[PDB]
Design an enzyme around this catalytic site. Structure first.
Site, short mmCIF file in Angstrom:
data_model
loop_
_atom_site.label_atom_id
_atom_site.label_comp_id
_atom_site.label_asym_id
_atom_site.label_seq_id
_atom_site.Cartn_x
_atom_site.Cartn_y
_atom_site.Cartn_z
N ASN A 47 0.80 -1.10 -0.09
CA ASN A 47 -0.01 0.02 0.34
C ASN A 47 0.63 1.77 -0.51
O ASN A 47 2.07 1.42 1.09
CB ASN A 47 -0.96 0.26 1.21
N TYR A 79 -7.91 13.37 -1.23
CA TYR A 79 -7.70 12.39 -0.32
C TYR A 79 -7.56 13.42 1.24
O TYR A 79 -6.55 14.40 1.07
CB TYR A 79 -6.91 11.40 -0.89
N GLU A 88 -10.73 9.66 7.31
CA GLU A 88 -10.08 9.03 6.52
C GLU A 88 -11.31 9.42 5.14
O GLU A 88 -11.76 8.65 4.82
CB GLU A 88 -8.98 8.02 5.77
N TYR A 90 -12.05 10.70 1.15
CA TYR A 90 -11.69 10.22 -0.40
C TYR A 90 -13.58 11.03 -1.58
O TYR A 90 -14.24 10.63 -1.03
CB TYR A 90 -11.79 8.57 -0.91
N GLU A 180 -3.40 6.50 -5.11
CA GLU A 180 -2.92 5.71 -3.78
C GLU A 180 -2.22 3.89 -4.64
O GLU A 180 -3.13 3.97 -6.26
CB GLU A 180 -4.14 4.95 -3.36
#
Length: 193
Positions: A47, A79, A88, A90, A180
């Site tokens: 990741n 992000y 978190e 997005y 990502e």
């Protein structure tokens, strides 16, 4: 000049904040270019996430252009994070093989913004990396119904749509136009605002 990194770090480059994060497997060549531009090339990673933007997020409108490509799992997304609550978030404009967040997301509705329509989800991550260390926390997702690489993201439209379905933000932390990758290889070349 362009400055290319392989070790995870943050800082400032041409007036833009940047965050480059990865866990240990594989290689990311994360390069910082003129103005709001960055590039990435990744292979054999588990990741990684990185890009340019702002050290503290807001309701600013964010414009970006460029390219993004992976034959595997990866995302091109506005992000960011908040604290108290730890979230978190997005705003996903493109993806590779797999459209996030998948079956573990609770679909809450849609929002129209920037000539697109985005599906809104809450998901939970368990013992995952975060800005406070490994943590269990909720994610807020807007996922565009059709893929694109380039345009404006009117962040306030998303924050307001999220709030109307109980996805309320905490105190803003960083906010970047991110690439990502997950267990994949690929590349991106993104110029922010």
């Amino acid at each position: 000049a362009q400055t290319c990194l392989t070790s995870p770090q943050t800082g400032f480059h041409n007036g833009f904040f940047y965050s480059f994060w990865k866990d240990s497997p594989g290689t990311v060549n994360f390069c910082l270019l003129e103005g709001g531009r960055y590039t990435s090339n990744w292979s054999g990673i588990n990741n990684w996430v990185g890009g340019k933007g702002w050290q503290t997020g807001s309701r600013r409108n964010i414009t970006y252009s460029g390219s993004f490509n992976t034959p595997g799992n990866g995302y091109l997304a506005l992000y960011g994070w908040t604290t108290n609550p730890l979230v978190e978030y997005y705003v996903v404009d493109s993806w590779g093989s797999w459209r996030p967040p998948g079956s573990d997301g609770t679909f809450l509705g849609t929002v129209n913004s920037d000539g697109g329509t985005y599906d809104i989800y809450r998901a939970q991550r368990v013992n995952a990396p975060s800005i406070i260390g490994n943590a269990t926390f909720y994610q807020y997702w807007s996922v565009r119904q059709s893929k694109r690489v380039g345009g404006t993201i009117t962040t306030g439209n998303h924050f307001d749509a999220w709030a109307s379905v109980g996805l309320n933000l905490g105190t803003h932390n960083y906010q970047i136009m991110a690439t990502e990758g997950y267990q994949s290889s690929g590349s991106s070349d993104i110029t922010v605002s």
